[PDB]
A paper describes a structure:
Further, we solved the structures of SARS-CoV-2 Mpro mutant (H41A) in complex with six cleavage substrates from replicase polyproteins. Substrate selectivity is revealed using structures of the H41A mutant in complex with six individual native cleavage substrates. We demonstrate that the subpockets (S1, S1′, S2, and S4) which are endowed with an exceptional selectivity are important for selective and potent binding. Additionally, other subsites such as S3 and S2′ to S4′, which have less specificity for substrate recognition, may also be used to enhance inhibitor binding and to specifically target Mpro.
Mpro is a cysteine protease that cleaves at no less than 11 sites on the replicase polyproteins. Initially, Mpro releases itself from the polyproteins through autocleavage. Then the mature Mpro forms a functional homodimer and transcleaves pp1a and pp1ab. Given its essential role in the viral life cycle and the absence of closely related homologs in the human genome, Mpro is considered an attractive target for anti-CoV drug development (12–14).
Author numbering:
A (entry chain A), B (entry chain A): 1 to 306
C (entry chain C), D (entry chain C): 301 to 310
Amino acid sequence: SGFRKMAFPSGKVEGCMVQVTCGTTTLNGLWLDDVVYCPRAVICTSEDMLNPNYEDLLIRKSNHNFLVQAGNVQLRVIGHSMQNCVLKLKVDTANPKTPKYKFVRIQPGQTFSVLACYNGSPSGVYQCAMRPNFTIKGSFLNGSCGSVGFNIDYDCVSFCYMHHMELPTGVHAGTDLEGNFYGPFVDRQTAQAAGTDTTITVNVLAWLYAAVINGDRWFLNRFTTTLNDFNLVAMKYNYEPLTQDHVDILGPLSAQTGIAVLDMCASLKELLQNGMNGRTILGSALLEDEFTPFDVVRQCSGVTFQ
Amino acid sequence: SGFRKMAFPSGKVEGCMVQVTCGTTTLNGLWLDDVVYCPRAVICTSEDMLNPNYEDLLIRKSNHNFLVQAGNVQLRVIGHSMQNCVLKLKVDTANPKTPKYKFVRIQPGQTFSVLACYNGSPSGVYQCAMRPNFTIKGSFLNGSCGSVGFNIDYDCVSFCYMHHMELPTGVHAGTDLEGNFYGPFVDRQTAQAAGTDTTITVNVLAWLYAAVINGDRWFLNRFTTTLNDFNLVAMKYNYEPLTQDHVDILGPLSAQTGIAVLDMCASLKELLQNGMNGRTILGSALLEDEFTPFDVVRQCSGVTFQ
Amino acid sequence: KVATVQSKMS
Amino acid sequence: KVATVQSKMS
């Protein structure tokens, strides 16, 4: 029993983190086989940052302008290229700790583990959701650029995020591992702002199922609702509209608890209209939307505690 | 910027997790040098569990009754002994992945990272506080027994918790790594209950400082309070009394933000008396008490964003 | 209800 | 206020 924001074990990713320095700028890199992937911002100084012609800066660089440090060992860069907003630095040594891996791009509403890193040294791990506006509510300081986000399936690491920047609101933006940004953001220090965010409805429902699986039914009611009638309430409260696919994905949790999805939607409708009245759900006083249905199933018992 | 429940990178601990089987019971073990530490409950069957004479069961066992599996390799047990509620299984192979480590017992109110494990395979990592009543609000299923909690300082792993059991309220109880339980709990399946819990006051204040460091001052006020007057409010709301040592530990955070500790206490007094009025602090709608002053300093910027 | 020792017993 | 590229620049 219990329900926690749980990250994946980070060791497979720890074995791949390196430090990349070009001039007086340093950040983190990801060393897989004989390639080190890192944000192209490593080739910029502070004055370059308003108007960087990343291209123009890269042609003026050689292989030996890139210092890659893996623990106590310097790796020799033998080739470099830019792919969108990341650099690929070919080194002369393949990483003996390279896990089975994939480069995956995730959807808003999905979750992943972040290994926060500084000077190529891992410092912390935490669980994140990709917000509908393509930002993440992370915890990152200067030097974190190049830390990665990931999921692990069996023993395959699916890398999905490389960290680049912090927006004025204090949320964070980055790219997939081919250097393509999530959302309408660019790697320069300019006035950028995220679009208006919404709450991930299917995730809130999944979390409500988690609460019932952990023996808690206080928010339940005897009412039901149509999909269209629920979505009319969701739009009023800045919740994402619910689809039949979301109802389908919630099926397994619905069968485990015996609560029809549209019945849980009615419970959520009541919670949105009435608040919580001083009560809590799984230790929170607001509706949590950073757990996916997969996250709930993975962590909760397969039996509901009736 | 940002503030997350952050765990330590788990790789150093992942390299030490093994599976221990004795008969038809299996759980997790911690393999350091040539010793595997595991809960003595591994020698019990389901019927043994109401009234286990762990002693009586152990003398009827040999070394070859203990199967230790590290990944794909069986380790040969060459010696066994019981120390309080843990077993020490001497094996014929020292773990080449043994980190620098310590066995530390923590205080209620302190935090640590939990590596949840099943069949010797790590499955998730999350951050926990030891509650004042010596329980932890974890997330554990059958098979988790023997998962460990830890902190990392530089490159030393200070192991502080080995998981044993879940209480009827769904909270969790375990031992330090010498097998001595935290709190008045025993490793048998009987009606046990934790003492009444309280809120960790110094931690809530530390978290309020974190919020100010992240640019948020809405809960602040122009009032102050004496230590004794604050503690009279704390006792009313089931908060721990605050000590001068707690005020001293909060000093560095107080100097970084320019908010005197007793001034922040007055802010907390107001929050306890008025609630939050629909607002949030660092994304929570209740007062968070599972971050220590050390946790805040470790994660937040050294500069406050004024 | 009674405490559970969270091994895996068969 | 302006976005920050969270490298460590000197």
